[PDB]
Amino acid sequence: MELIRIAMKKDLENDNSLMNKWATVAGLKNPNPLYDFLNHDGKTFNEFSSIVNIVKSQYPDREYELMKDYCLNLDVKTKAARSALEYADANMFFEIEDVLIDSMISCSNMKSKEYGKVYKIHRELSNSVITEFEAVKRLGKLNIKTPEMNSFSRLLLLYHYLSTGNFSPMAQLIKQIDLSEISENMYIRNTYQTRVHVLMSNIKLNENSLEECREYSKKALESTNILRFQVFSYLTIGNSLLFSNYELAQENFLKGLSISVQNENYNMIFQQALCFLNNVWRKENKWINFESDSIMDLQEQAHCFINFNENSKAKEVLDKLDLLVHNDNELAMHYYLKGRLEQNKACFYSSIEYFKKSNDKFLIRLPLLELQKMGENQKLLELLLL
């Protein structure tokens, strides 16, 4: 007997008007499927959004607790469980997701087996348990039938490229996704639509089309009630304003933090965002994470030290960084920091070269601005943005 069903029964006893309110929020014609759901074990809604929407409306603070219990009791052979897998991945509920995956890889239903195996490849790729090559091979071998997994096999690569600073292949890979071929599962289709919007927003950011970046994040916001997507929309909109509008960037990062502060991971992401913003604008920076040894946090320490002429403290941090392995995007940032410390043109040239390898047309603005300040030809600098 699921916790959600116990809670709803209790709340219904205290307020009869909930039946009709829940029916509306669940997008139902009448309360019949709700009566059925409350009274009969294993009855599932037609669309997974019905249960999600009721939980968000009625128990917003108990969502994880209730959906964990609910998802982990589903028959993994059902459409509801397939929906649940996507729900768990979309919200980064990895404990729910990995249990669902494991059940579904070895079950008798062919749709559930394929979902399970594609999501497992995504989980492994994003944990660096396998390489891109190994992932692409394993996906090829599955001979994917569903339009859903056809979409997701492309989405999982997009996430990989975004997080490894490899922006070149993203624009063409996303065009291949056709969500209109998904007909069975509306929850999956609509959630994937949100995913595509947020990824598109990131792709446009990296191309330096910033109004377009903002439009896609706004479309993500309107399309969704999922915190993970809202977080990344506000992050991306704020990011797009990093060079042009301090106040509006800060307002987006704070808005994001305000809806997500209770989650450790999102809380950290917005601190890092605000940390980066305050360095770019050379303000006093209360957002530095001094405990962390990641490239991302160390770079921000060094950047702050440089802004405030603590050069030998900057140099110490950069020495720690010289001993760590960088991808191209990270090394581009590293050379910018060395350029700022040493006031050395050659470091800005190297920085430009590595942003170009990474296909980052956004952050390249950092060494370009320094060259402008040193009186380099402004027109050539603008041309280096294209």
């Binding site: 995913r195 992050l235 992401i269 965002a273 990270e330």
Partner: peptide, 6 residues
Amino acid sequence: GMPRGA
């Protein structure tokens, strides 16, 4: 670096 995510 600047956090990115989707």
